[PDB]
Amino acid sequence: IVEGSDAEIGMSPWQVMLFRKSPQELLCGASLISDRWVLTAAHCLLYPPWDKNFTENDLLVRIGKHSRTRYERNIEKISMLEKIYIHPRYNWRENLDRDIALMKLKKPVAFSDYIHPVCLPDRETAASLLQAGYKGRVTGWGNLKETGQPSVLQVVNLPIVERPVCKDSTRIRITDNMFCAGYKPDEGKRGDACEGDSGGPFVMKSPFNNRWYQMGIVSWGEGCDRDGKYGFYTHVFRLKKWIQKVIDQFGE
Amino acid sequence: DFEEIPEEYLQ
Amino acid sequence: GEADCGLRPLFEKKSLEDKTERELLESYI
Ligand SMILES: Cc1ccc(C(=O)N2CCC[C@H]2C(=O)NCc2cc(Cl)ccc2CN)[nH]1
Ligand SMILES: *[C@@H]1O[C@H](CO)[C@@H](O)[C@H](O)[C@H]1NC(C)=O
Ligand SMILES: [Mg+2]
């Protein structure tokens, strides 16, 4: 996270760390959506340009964390993966279209003060909140700068950007399965996600029922926090039919 | 850079 | 847990607000 701040304790209890077993390192972010299901970006698991193709046994999910590198004894919970499900129409070749994956845990995670699921939006919440100017929150343990690494979970609040402004900022083709966020060079404020924050959630607090909803998944950007560039997020609601299909077919 | 984790999860 | 989703034990469950959630609410016009 670039131009963010340290998260408060229990501020993002759905935040999940995707952790590589060997060498021991942070791979990505992810989010807890039930006691058995974790949501992340498909590119965190499969990205052939970088020779990335992780299998279940290669990874651990660490839930309830705050410190990036420390083992947070009696707080964090470490879970093993039962199965990885990548969107069948995930487009790693061009623009990371449908950058979404689900991970089913071997055992259910016990909820606590530091571990709690985020909601998934329904059509009404998405239509009400996914609007230009409305701000969401991005969290992660990723790089602090494009060209170092934080001691604890970082947080940044960022405004959703108008689709024409998103499209005009880049040469990449932007799809309806993406939305973009960040400040315009003229706004004065800064911030973005960066490498290592992918798979993490873009959340919004509904002013109707006071619950936190995961509207986006940290996906891609041209660098980190560049003027005139924006961060791109997977549109969770647009891919909810796939989410529900996977959960309905492979059990909750 | 990462503090070691219990072996029960690494196996 | 769908029923209780998105309600934080250290915040919403205790009617405590975090330091920057007000910035999100203010943006929802
Ligand atoms: C122009 C372009 C092609 C691919 C990427 C990209 O961002 N990738 C390729 C695979 C990993 C992912 C990444 O770095 N995501 C993190 C990220 C996410 C966001 Cl929202 C903003 C910036 C960044 C940092 N580039 N960007
Ligand atoms: C990823 O690995 C699996 C084996 O675990 C293989 O079947 C699959 O074809 C690989 N995908 C790519 C795109 O390399
Ligand atoms: Mg920018």
Taking the alpha carbons of A20, A23, A25, A28 in that order, is the dihedral positive or negative? negative
What strands lie across the sheet with A201-205, from one edge to the other?
A5-6, A154-159, A135-140, A201-205, A212-220, A231-235, A178-181
Nearest CA to ligand 1 atom 19: A220
Tokens 């209780």, residue located = C4
Q: Architecture of domain A13-117+238-251 in CATH?
A: Beta Barrel (2.40)
* Cβ–Cβ < 8 Å for A125, A206: yes
Nearest CA to ligand 1 atom 8: A220
CATH number of A1-12+118-237: 2.40.10.10
Question: Which residue stretches of A95-239 are H helix?
Answer: 123-129, 163-168
Q: CB within 8 A of B6, min separation 6: which ones?
A: A71, A78
Strand (E) or helix (H) holding C26: helix C21-27
Could you give the CA distance from residue A46 to residue A165 in angstroms, rounded to a whole number? Answer: 29
**Tokens standing for residue A51:** 């020779």
Strand partners, A136: A158
Establish whether domains A1-12+118-237 and A13-117+238-251 are of one fold.
yes
Three-state DSSP at A112 gives: coil
Three-state DSSP at A52 gives: strand
Nearest CA among A64, A71, A78, A70 for reference residue A9? A64
Way the structure was solved: X-ray
**Tokens standing for residue A8:** 């408060």
Domain at C18, CATH number: 4.10.140.10
Tokens 């999100």, residue located = C24
* Cβ–Cβ < 8 Å for A4, A156: yes
Ligand nearest to the CA of A42: 1
* Cβ–Cβ < 8 Å for A247, A188: no
* Cβ–Cβ < 8 Å for A158, A80: no
Kindly provide the resolution of this structure in angstroms, with one decimal. Answer: 1.5
Total of domains in chain C? 1
Could you give the CA distance from residue A80 to residue A65 in angstroms, rounded to a whole number? Answer: 16
Instruction: Inspect the structure and tell me whether chains A and B have 3 or more CB pairs less than 8 Å apart.
Output: yes
Strands A178-181 and A231-235 come out as antiparallel
HSE-up (13 A, CA, CB side) for residue A73: 4
Tokens 């924006």, residue located = A230
Phi, psi at residue A11, to the nearest 5°?
A: -70, -30
Catalytic residues of A: 43, 99, 198
The parent domain of residue C22 ranges over 1-29
**Tokens standing for residue A99:** 């950058």
Nearest chain A residue (CA) to C7: A211
Could you give the CA distance from residue A196 to residue A214 in angstroms, rounded to a whole number? Answer: 18
- Whether the bond into A121 is cis, omega within 30 of 0: no
Q: What is the DSSP string of A175-194?
A: PTTEEEE---GGGS---B--
Could you give the CA distance from residue A15 to residue A7 in angstroms, rounded to a whole number? Answer: 11
**How is chain A split into domains, by residue range?**
1-12+118-237, 13-117+238-251
Strand partners, A19: A26, A60
With a 6 Å cutoff on the Cβ, whether A55 touches ligand 2 is: yes
